[PDB]
Design a protein around this ligand. Sequence first.
Ligand SMILES: CCCCCCCCCCCCCCCCCC(=O)OC[C@H](COP(=O)(O)OCCN)OC(=O)CCCCCCCCCCCCCCCCC
Ligand SMILES: CCCCCCCCCCCC(=O)OC[C@H](COP(=O)(O)OCC[N+](C)(C)C)OC(=O)CCCCCCCCCCC
Lengths: 469, 49, 93, 185, 89, 68, 128
Amino acid sequence: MLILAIISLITFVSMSKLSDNRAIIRLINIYLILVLVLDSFLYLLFLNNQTYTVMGELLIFNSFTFYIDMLIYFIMIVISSLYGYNLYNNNLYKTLFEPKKELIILFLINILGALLIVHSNDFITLFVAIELQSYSIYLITAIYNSSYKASKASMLYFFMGGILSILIAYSINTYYSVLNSYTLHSLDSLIINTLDLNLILIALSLGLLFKIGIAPLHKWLISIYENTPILITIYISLIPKISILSYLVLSNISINSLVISILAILTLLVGSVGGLLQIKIKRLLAFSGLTNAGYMMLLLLLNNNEFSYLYYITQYSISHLAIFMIIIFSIYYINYINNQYNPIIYVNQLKGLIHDNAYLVLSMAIVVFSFIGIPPLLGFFGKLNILMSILNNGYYFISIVLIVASLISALYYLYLLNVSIQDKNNILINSNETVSSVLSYILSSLIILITFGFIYNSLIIDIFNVYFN
Amino acid sequence: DPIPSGALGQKVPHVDESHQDLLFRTSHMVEDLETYDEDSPINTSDANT
Amino acid sequence: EVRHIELPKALYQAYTKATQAIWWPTYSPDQVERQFLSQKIDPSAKTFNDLDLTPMELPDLMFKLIRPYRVNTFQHDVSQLENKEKTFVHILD
Amino acid sequence: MMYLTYYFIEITIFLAILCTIFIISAKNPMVSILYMIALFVIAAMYLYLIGLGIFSLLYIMIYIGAIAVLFLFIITLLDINSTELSVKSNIRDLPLVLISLIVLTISGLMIYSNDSILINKLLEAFGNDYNTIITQDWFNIENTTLLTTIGNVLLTNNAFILLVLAIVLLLGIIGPISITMKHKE
Amino acid sequence: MFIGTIILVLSFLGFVFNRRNIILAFICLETMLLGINLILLRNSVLFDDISGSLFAIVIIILAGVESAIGLSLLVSYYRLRGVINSYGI
Amino acid sequence: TAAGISLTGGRNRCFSEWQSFMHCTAKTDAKSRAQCLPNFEDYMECLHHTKEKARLREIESVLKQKKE
Amino acid sequence: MNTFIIFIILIPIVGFALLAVNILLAVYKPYNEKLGAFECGLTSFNQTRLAFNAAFILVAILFLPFDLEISTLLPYVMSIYLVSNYGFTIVLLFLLILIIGFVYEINTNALKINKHNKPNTDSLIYKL
Ligand SMILES: CCCCCCCCCCCCCCCCCC(=O)OC[C@H](COP(=O)(O)OCCN)OC(=O)CCCCCCCCCCCCCCCCC
Ligand SMILES: CCCCCCCCCCCC(=O)OC[C@H](COP(=O)(O)OCC[N+](C)(C)C)OC(=O)CCCCCCCCCCC
């Protein structure tokens, strides 16, 4: 469906004006919805965790990957809704948020690379898909070429991703030099304990992981997320992370690594501490994503990590989308538009939002306390399942570091809420412009999921026990 | 009563049109605390004209 | 940077003596002989000033004479050019 | 006469080191591109030496013929200022440069062997002493070369990666138009 | 094995310690890919295996597309700025 | 997918050892997988020729110092 | 020593023959204005580059992917018999997917040169 979509949209966008790109995005959003509705019955193939090898033995299809694909479709639906539906029908919001002509095509190609990463079973497919993701996401960072910051980020991202791709290719070709193979199915107990193979494998893991900001290589991606447009940041900060971490979780590559443990501790400490003096919103959220990436690095050392990873990545995706959507909604009440691309930059521009929109601040509070991991919300159950796994597998110092990072991160998560529930002079009394219906419904649905998804945890576990065990 | 404070109680700048000026370029603060935009409509009014 | 070597007499004189076998003019051995003979001005002889002439001297005319061989590599300190260059069109759409 | 052509792999290694140093060292980046072309020539030589002249010609027609051409195309059209290699600017790198040279080379040579003790992992990499026997079989009845087999596997056993490279090339067309062109309406 | 590791390492160092150009960064990336492909093809010959040559030709294609995209991004950067300086990417 | 294919389109140099090892893996479970240690050693020996190199080092050293 | 090898080495290490013949035989006594370059012409320290149209660089950037396409078709034409009626369909799908991008290129008019000083086409209307 994605390739059909790509081959259709290329023609239909070539033969269409720039006045039609928003409606094109709406069309393909409804297309993705219909796909996720009608074709999602394929979950029955994976009953009792039946796994399939496709295209020779180049792709792998199981419940894990089907779930990640449904999740990526859901994310693309939300991100396309943010481009296909105007928040307000004003000249300002037709200057700030306009889709460029090729943006949807590049999004769909990046989604294709994401899914061919998670579905990969041979390293040639992995490399082709990594490059199809990274080239497309370079161009996504660069499509708003009237921004100095975005062009600069485009080029930094090109070079750093290029170097890390060199690392991935070196790892792959060294694995081939040793074993004469490109497939991880070629490994077993005997081959692991007979060959020393951890340098190659951890080189691959780090080449994949530094592409999502794992410390000490975080500053460049945080600068890229800061310097890009908000509606591009929301995509480029989430989907690569899902793709690469899902590949590294499905591939059991770092089961008791000391290096990955060390770097995960470092990611937690950096992502918690460095976000304390950040005055800007996107850098704060970038460090939040960094510490969540650390929490998800921890479950690359387990060998039974599907439930924890899927729960945490789903809840982090919902929270990430919700918080970026709240920052997008808050632009109507900020008193100073900073740029055409990042209309809101600093956290103190959210001062007094409760007096203009109180339920938007209720949403912000729900998301902030899910990030902190406060029950009965969803992030609490995420953290609980992660802790369950890592303590069942014997990581006792990492657990205390995890608690300390959970505590230190709460400060910069609460910075937002604190300034939002402060008092402000020159409040809003009336406004005849109303925000969109669709985007309001999407945000409300995400917030309601965060708030009331714990009701279904029993049912989710019972389904997992049939499709993943 | 208002002076902007941060997450850790530290001083934060109130960002205006005040310091998108040519004065506050060519200073070497870190990427986090710079406050010069380089994409502001104040600076980029004559760009590729 | 003009290149100079300063190698001995018995060798350069022989190299010059050898290069007189080609047909085109080259540095002669008697010239490297004259390399040891500085100017001894005869004081009894007349001079320019008897002709009411005042010569130029080399440093004021070296510019005029050597500027054809001046390369003029690049401009000076293209920093402070960035923000003015930002206002021009560099790729025409 | 026999061993006059023995050290032609070592000569290519030496020339590659030289051309990389000249790339790093050249004043004008046009000269760096020309030395990159010379390094591609050296690699193509080495590939002929080990028996892959098809890849040598593919390299000559792709890398030198298109990529280097595009490099020259852009430096002919864009102002790319340059700071010359200096001792007041680059000499600070020597300690880290040397440390990284030693560490990276030794790790790159250690990574290829499966022996447990670390020093022996380098000593096996330098164990290039004994020659390979090339015996002849009579089982291959066809005229299959490397390009034929690449096509066979790429169009039958690996058709998916070809039909994904198609979308990669579509990106190669659609991205640059989106980034370089400005659409009117 | 030797020529490729050497080209790779020297290209990586000439990328990391480049205070001069952006063209040198492009060149060092391309030479890094070259070095990987040469190690790959030497192993392909020694094992008598096609997967290495397949991966190599795929790298050729992907590196070409990488060069095209990178030099489009540079052209956008130059659209806005007009001069690509010693520093600042 | 392209595993076990030569440069000429056929079986590679170390196919037979790999195929023996994979037969023994198909016979076995993860607890009986240690029976396939000699087969994997043979496959890796065909690949890299470590033991033959050490053997020839011994032969050469006897040709080297016990004579001169 | 094969005739191929002899020729391909001999051409480079002999090609400077007439170069040396010309360097040794011919006069060389330059002037300033013989080292010059034109009838008239000058330029102050204004810039090092001229503004160029996008198509000039886009033709080169698009040469790479289409060249790689046509070079990736070489394995097919050297494997055409062995991949009988399967690889045929596969390479047809390949060519169709790559024709979609060519269609995009044509419909966007990316290699067209646009003109700034348009001719005026608007009517002459007189307020009475
Ligand atoms: C990409 C850019 C292009 C440039 C590329 C450069 C070449 C690439 C070099 C190799 C690839 C980079 C690898 C990245 C570093 C991280 C590697 C790693 O983490 O793997 C370590 C791994 C053991 O770690 P682990 O499995 O997690 O823990 C269980 C332990 N039983 O496995 C190991 O146990 C490692 C084995 C230990 C030996 C390491 C070799 C170092 C030797 C250096 C000695 C130098 C001499 C002394 C100092 C000289 C200075 C003057
Ligand atoms: C799937 C779209 C994801 C998009 C995001 C929306 C969340 C949907 C959750 C349904 C998951 C499921 O019901 O499945 C349970 C899955 C595996 O089951 P499955 O193989 O995927 O079959 C599902 C067949 N469907 C597609 C027809 C439904 O176990 C898991 O670990 C799910 C962990 C997610 C926890 C988050 C809970 C959110 C609260 C839900 C309130 C209604």
